[PDB]
Design a binder for this molecule. Structure first.
Ligand SMILES: [Zn+2]
Ligand SMILES: [Zn+2]
Lengths: 30, 262, 66, 112, 147, 20, 115, 98, 49, 335, 135
């Protein structure tokens, strides 16, 4: 399956994608 | 004859053995002299002719300071403090030269065999760098690429381990007596059981279990030691044991003759 | 940075097995625990040194000064 | 407030402490650089003459050390340059400056 | 300081000939007072040290993970099957004579770091120096040798 | 129980290489 | 800097011996000895072996402070018998015992020798 | 049983230095306060261009090691790559003097 | 540095009250760290995202 | 302005000096009946005391071996002719619980050295020796007992650990059910409130009486849990040895760290309805449960929930802001 | 000149642990002096004890102010030193109960005891003493 729910371990990849997009200095930069 | 000694295992670099019919102060003093007063040779003073790397120079110096050398004939030479001369005569010190170049497109390494003997070696087997791997390489110093130059004049004098760990040959020790708590000098911490909350000693089998119910032996005394000494390999392990014995005995003989002078 | 010399805990010569410890990952696909086993530091006191060293000298030297 | 009921001073020290279990209460541990830097005037009697003369010969460096000498008038001869170093006879009625030798009385402060 | 606020300074330094030492001779880097612990209530330092020891023996790096399920029981069983004490206590020896020690010691690897306020910027002493022209008093500043 | 004290990532990247 | 210098680890000071004896007045035949430039190496051993002989009475040694490489030692014995001759007998017993240790270790490591 | 949203991870209510606190539940809160105050005054490394990047104050140690304990977040704070201090082997003993 | 980029600072005045925003509030969740505050006369003034 | 005539503070009508934490813990270790000591120690401490008379004390117990008590060797360091009585709650001259303290002719007879006798107190030992013998011999008294306890504590060795903290599982589940029945009685009282029949206690308002009830129930739960944890805790527990030895920590510290925290709060009221209708946006509406307002369930050791972490930060931050304002105000009024 | 000043056989009832690991507590009655009562502290391990054990006590005024103690000097010492439990301490307090039964409490360093008996009410001891116990 690909349509399964999401274990608590998994969300670090979401954090990876979010930081690779925004960056830390995103507030000042935006 | 008194202090009987028995070997367990030997190699090129570590010796584990049995010391019996001896005393606790004798063993402790043996350890202390074994880590403290074994004279050898190592690099001490450095002359940077020209540096170009991305490292700095006294960093390279302290990096150099820990390279051990050949140490057989170290008794033959003399301390610079007691030597009549000034500035590193051939009797009291040795000279080291290192050369590297930025030749290749890729990165370049410097191994500790690349340093060479310079001055008069006068036939005494002294000051070669120790190789341990299969591939001829004394341990790494610095990395360079295509543009950087190092010219190193270095002078190595005597030194001892007690003022700085540069001249320490020991760099490991092991120490055991009463593996089975028969002398009962300390208890064990426990939360529900003394036995299962602790592992057995590896030295367990050479002394019997404590018979489980006999009264506390009061007039027993410490003996039956377990010494495993693993030297650095700058000097062989038999030589460091017999030389630690030798410097302990010469120290005690020195204080005895000073007393009879007084 | 540079993997250092003579472990604070034990004190034996450390860094002989360094690029060895490197090349037992890539062309062997070898797990680090058995890789440290075969590497042969039976204490842990030196095992940690290579475990938590982080290279910096590569990122240092891939400048081009002078 | 910043000039009359409180102000700057002289003969001052300011470092950070460590404990010790071997020094009793009326002592204090003082570092030797500070003992070189500080001073204390004395007088010249028949009693202190030889120890003071020896400490003057010791120079401005070695730890029982002197830095200044004061004769009868408004006299400040400094021992650092002092090319007539081993020559002063140190007559009575005079004042010398010396480092802190041990068990001198000394007052202590901590803010606030 | 620590990673939990255990600031201070350094008492003395001895050497290994009288440092406390264990069966495998793992001499310490630094030693502090237990009386920090039951007043500042810093359990996080101790659990960091225990996980650090099991990480050192394992080869795996550790984990902190603020709201998760890693417990002292799992840490204890893992380090126990790695062949040591179930909590971190240890047989230990006298520095001087090497007699047995009565108690036992929680002892192991931990992460520290270095501050900025070093001693040479703070040592300062003065006698009969420069004068401020407005007030005829000793001037300010460690830079210009103040009071 | 397994209780997940530690976790793997590229082994799962590979498992999805076979899955896709 | 003019502290006492770094030759106080092992080197002898000029104009000063390796030791100075000193008579106490606290007890009959009681003496203390000042040692300097050494440590527990000689200290613990000389105390333990002088304690082992039983014609002598009482001993202990201590360091004043680790910043100074010096230590003291306090000896008394019964009348007629003397502390200085007692400890010189103790030192001969030391050097004899360890010399036996040295030669026995050497013969043992030689009879070990592989192949 | 009427949720509409869940957080990505509860660990991510923190801040920058608060990430570095190992097991930050397992202490008392004013200790976290002094830790966040203290971590700004740590040396180590700051950038990598420092052979060229001149400034008045600069503090670089020798041998920086990534800490044996960590959380998941300072992987994303790049702190594994550029650490603050190094590990050591600490003791808890009242060793009689100091 | 990566701390110091994300700083915030309010003005209040000299003395102020205490239920007024010197101390933290329940509204602060998910936005500002409830630990990374500076210490000394301005605790609860500067706060970090 | 020297120390030995500043031993007693004039301001507080009691001496404010004192032997402190580490030597205090060590002398509590030394004073116990069950321990003894050997020649190689007792000889070395006897040389360690600077004003020792050149006389060894007699063997306390002889038969295979000379041995001594720590009380016997400390009686050397105590100077002569000093007398004290404690006599608190046991102390029937044959002390089974081993409290109390009594010294005749500068020699210990029995008792357990503890800060409430040997530290700073109204009937302090330091007060006694300074007032009687002359206020500079007490300086050497601190030197003597400080050096002796230090050197004996060296070869003894002492520490703590997590094994102090964790305790027995049946006692853990007793803590759990105690908190659970407290929650059950809280739920019963809330149901009685929600059916509008209550006492509405005199003086305050209906809600205030409800708050008084739930605060009293939860505090009784907390300290009953702490009492159970402390009475279960063992006699070789080193942090129990620390706290009833004196110097640092308390029963409240041990209970706080080991069993439960209790409801964090600001200004007496529990954590206010910040958002509308509820406490934090993470629960359902209109609740007064111990989870809802945020009574802290767990101890330190098992961890927290993020809600309890947040409330803990709230109470700590309140403590910090009140300290940082009150320091300036107290400095002004003092000046 | 050095003599026993009180000596009888005493029978222990039982022994209390007292939550310790090297000491315990004894209480005992005389066979002869039914008025007399004994209790005593003891290093429990180094001489083990049990219920229903007959024991013998001894005053031992001295062994024929003492100086610094001599190491035991293994030659023959015709003293009161040939029993097992030899033990030295100090008296501190005298008690009068029932107008007849005198009571004194000696010490042993960190050890305590309670002793009765009204026949020897001057022959009993005074400031310090020894103790001797057989088997
Ligand atoms: Zn020469
Ligand atoms: Zn190592």
């Amino acid at each position: 399956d690909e349509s399964a729910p999401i274990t608590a371990e998994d969300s670090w990849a979401v954090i990876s994608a979010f930081f690779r997009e925004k960056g830390l200095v995103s507030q000042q930069l935006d | 004859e008194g202090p009987q000694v028995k070997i367990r295992e030997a190699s090129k670099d570590n010796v584990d053995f049995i010391l019996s019919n001896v005393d606790l102060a004798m063993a402790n003093s043996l350890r202390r002299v074994m880590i403290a007063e074994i004279p050898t040779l190592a690099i001490d003073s450095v002359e940077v002719e020209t540096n170009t790397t991305v490292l700095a120079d006294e960093f390279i110096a302290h990096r150099l300071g820990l390279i051990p050398l050949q140490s057989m004939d170290i008794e033959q030479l003399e301390y610079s403090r007691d030597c009549f001369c000034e500035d590193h005569c051939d009797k009291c010190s040795v000279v080291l030269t290192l050369q590297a170049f930025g030749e290749s497109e890729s990165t370049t390494n410097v191994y500790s065999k690349d340093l060479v003997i310079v001055s008069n070696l006068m036939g005494r087997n002294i000051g070669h760098p120790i190789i341990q791997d299969k591939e001829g390489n004394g341990v790494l110093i610095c990395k360079l690429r295509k543009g950087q130059e190092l010219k190193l004049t270095c002078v190595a004098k005597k030194g001892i381990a007690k003022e700085h760990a540069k001249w320490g040959p020991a760099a490991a020790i092991e120490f055991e007596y009463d593996p089975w708590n028969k002398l009962k000098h300390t208890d064990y911490w426990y939360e529900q059981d003394s036995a299962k909350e602790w592992p057995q000693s590896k030295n367990c089998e050479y002394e019997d279990p404590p018979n489980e119910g006999d009264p506390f032996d009061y007039k027993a005394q410490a003996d039956t030691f377990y010494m495993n000494v693993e030297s650095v390999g700058s000097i062989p392990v038999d030589q460091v044991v017999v030389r630690g014995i030798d410097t302990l005995q010469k120290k005690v003989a020195s204080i005895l003759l000073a007393l009879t002078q007084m | 940075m540079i993997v250092p010399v003579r472990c604070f805990s034990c004190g034996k010569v450390v860094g002989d097995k360094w690029e060895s410890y490197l090349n037992l990952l890539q062309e062997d696909e070898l797990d680090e625990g058995t890789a440290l086993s075969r590497l042969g530091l039976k204490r842990y006191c030196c095992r940690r040194m290579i475990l938590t060293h982080v290279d910096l000298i590569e990122k240092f030297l891939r400048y081009n000064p002078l | 407030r910043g000039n009359l009921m409180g102000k700057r001073v002289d003969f001052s020290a300011r470092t950070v402490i460590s404990g010790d279990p071997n020094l009793e209460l009326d002592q204090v541990g003082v570092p030797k650089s500070i003992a070189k830097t500080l001073t204390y005037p004395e007088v010249v009697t028949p009693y202190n003459i030889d120890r003071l003369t020896q400490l003057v010969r010791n120079g401005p460096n070695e730890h029982p050390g002197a830095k200044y000498v004061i004769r009868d008038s408004g006299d400040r001869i400094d021992l650092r340059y002092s090319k007539r170093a081993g020559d002063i006879q140190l007559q009575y009625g005079w004042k010398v400056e010396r480092h802190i030798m041990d068990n001198d009385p000394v007052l202590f402060n901590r803010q606030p | 300081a620590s990673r939990h606020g255990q600031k201070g300074t350094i008492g003395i330094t001895y050497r290994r000939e009288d440092m406390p030492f264990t069966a495998e001779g793992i001499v310490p880097d630094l030693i502090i007072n237990p009386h920090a612990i039951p007043s500042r209530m810093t359990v996080a330092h101790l659990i960091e040290c225990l996980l650090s020891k099991v990480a050192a023996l394992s080869g795996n790096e550790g984990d902190a993970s603020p709201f998760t399920d890693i417990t002292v029981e799992g840490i204890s069983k893992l380090l126990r099957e790695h062949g040591y004490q179930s909590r971190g206590f240890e047989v230990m020896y006298n520095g001087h004579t090497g007699k047995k020690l009565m108690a036992q010691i929680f002892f192991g690897p931990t992460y520290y770091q270095r501050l900025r306020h070093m001693v040479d910027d703070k040592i300062h002493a003065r006698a009969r120096g420069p004068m401020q022209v407005l007030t005829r008093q000793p001037v300010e500043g460690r830079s210009r040798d103040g009071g | 129980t397994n209780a997940s004290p530690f976790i793997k990532r590229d082994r799962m990247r590979r498992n999805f290489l076979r899955m896709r | 800097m003019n502290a006492p210098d770094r030759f106080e680890l092992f080197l002898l000071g000029e104009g000063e011996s390796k030791l100075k004896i000193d008579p106490d007045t606290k007890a009959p035949n009681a003496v203390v000895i000042t040692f300097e430039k050494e440590d527990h190496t000689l200290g613990n051993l000389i105390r333990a072996e002088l304690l082992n002989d039983r014609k002598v009475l009482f001993a202990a040694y201590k360091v004043e402070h680790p910043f100074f490489a010096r230590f003291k030692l306090r000896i008394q014995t019964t009348e007629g018998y003397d502390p200085k001759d007692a400890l010189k007998n103790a030192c001969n017993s030391i050097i004899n015992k360890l010399g036996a240790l040295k030669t026995n270790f050497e013969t043992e490591w030689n009879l070990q020798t592989l192949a | 049983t009427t949720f509409t949203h869940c957080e990505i991870h509860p660990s991510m209510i923190l801040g920058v230095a608060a990430s570095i606190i190992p097991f930050p539940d397992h202490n008392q809160s004013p200790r976290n306060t002094y830790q966040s105050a203290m971590g700004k005054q740590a040396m180590g490394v700051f950038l990598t261009n420092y052979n060229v990047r001149m400034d008045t104050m600069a503090n670089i140690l020798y041998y920086p090691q990534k800490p044996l304990g960590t959380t998941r977040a300072m992987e994303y704070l790049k702190f594994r790559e550029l650490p603050a201090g190094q590990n050591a082997i600490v003791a808890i003993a009242c060793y009689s003097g100091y | 540095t990566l701390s110091h980029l994300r700083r915030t600072n309010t003005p209040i005045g000299r003395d102020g009250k205490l239920a007024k925003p010197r101390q933290l509030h329940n509204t602060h969740w998910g936005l500002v760290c409830p630990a990374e505050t500076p210490e000394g006369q301005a605790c609860g003034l500067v706060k970090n995202l | 302005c020297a120390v030995p005539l500043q031993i007693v503070s004039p301001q507080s009508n009691k001496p404010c000096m004192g032997i402190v934490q580490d030597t205090l813990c060590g002398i509590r270790k030394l004073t116990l009946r069950d321990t003894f000591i050997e020649l190689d120690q007792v000889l070395n401490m006897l040389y360690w005391v600077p004003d020792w008379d050149g006389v060894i004390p007699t063997p306390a117990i002889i038969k295979p071996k000379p041995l001594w008590s720590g009380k016997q060797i400390l009686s050397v360091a105590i100077p002569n002719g000093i007398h004290l009585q404690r006599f608190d709650e046991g102390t029937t001259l044959l002390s089974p619980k081993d409290n109390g303290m009594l010294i005749i002719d500068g020699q210990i007879i029995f008792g357990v050295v503890e800060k409430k006798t040997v530290g700073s107190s109204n009937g302090g030992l330091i007060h006694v020796v300074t007032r009687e013998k002359g206020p500079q011999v007490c300086a050497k008294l601190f030197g003597n007992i400080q050096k002796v306890v230090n050197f004996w504590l060296l070869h003894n060795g002492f520490s703590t650990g997590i094994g102090d903290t964790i305790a027995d599982g049946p006692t853990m589940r007793e803590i759990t059910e105690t908190i659970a029945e407290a929650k059950k009685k809280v739920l019963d009282v809330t149901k009685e409130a929600q059916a509008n029949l209550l006492t509405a206690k005199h003086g305050m308002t209906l809600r205030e009486s409800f708050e008084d009830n739930v605060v009293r129930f939860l505090n009784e739960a907390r300290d009953k849990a702490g009492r159970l944890a402390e009475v279960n805790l063992k006699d070789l527990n080193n942090v129990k040895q620390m706290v009833m030895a004196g110097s640092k920590g308390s029963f409240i510290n041990i209970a706080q760290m080991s069993a439960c925290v209790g409801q964090q709060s600001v200004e007496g009221k529990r954590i206010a309805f910040g958002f509308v209708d509820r406490t934090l946006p993470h629960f359902s509406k209109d609740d007064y449960s111990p989870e809802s307002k945020g009574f802290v369930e767990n101890s330190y050791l098992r961890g927290l929930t993020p809600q309890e972490f947040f409330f803990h930060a709230m109470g700590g931050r309140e403590g910090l802001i009140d300290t940082a304002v009150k320091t300036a105000e107290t400095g002004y009024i003092q000046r | 000149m050095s003599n026993t000043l009180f000596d009888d056989i005493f029978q222990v009832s039982e022994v209390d642990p007292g939550r310790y690991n090297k000491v315990c507590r004894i209480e005992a009655a005389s066979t002869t002096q039914d008025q007399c009562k004994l209790t005593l502290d003891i290093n429990v391990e180094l001489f083990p004890v049990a219920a229903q054990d007959s024991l013998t006590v001894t005053i031992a005024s001295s062994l024929n102010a003492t100086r610094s103690w001599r190491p035991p000097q293994a030659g023959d010492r015709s003293l009161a030193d040939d029993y097992d439990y030899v033990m030295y301490g100090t008296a501190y307090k005298f008690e009068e109960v029932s107008k007849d039964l005198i009571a004194v409490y000696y010490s042993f360093g960190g050890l305590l005891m309670r002793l009765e008996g009204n026949y020897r009410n001057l022959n009993n001891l005074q400031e310090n003493a020894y103790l001797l116990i057989r088997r």
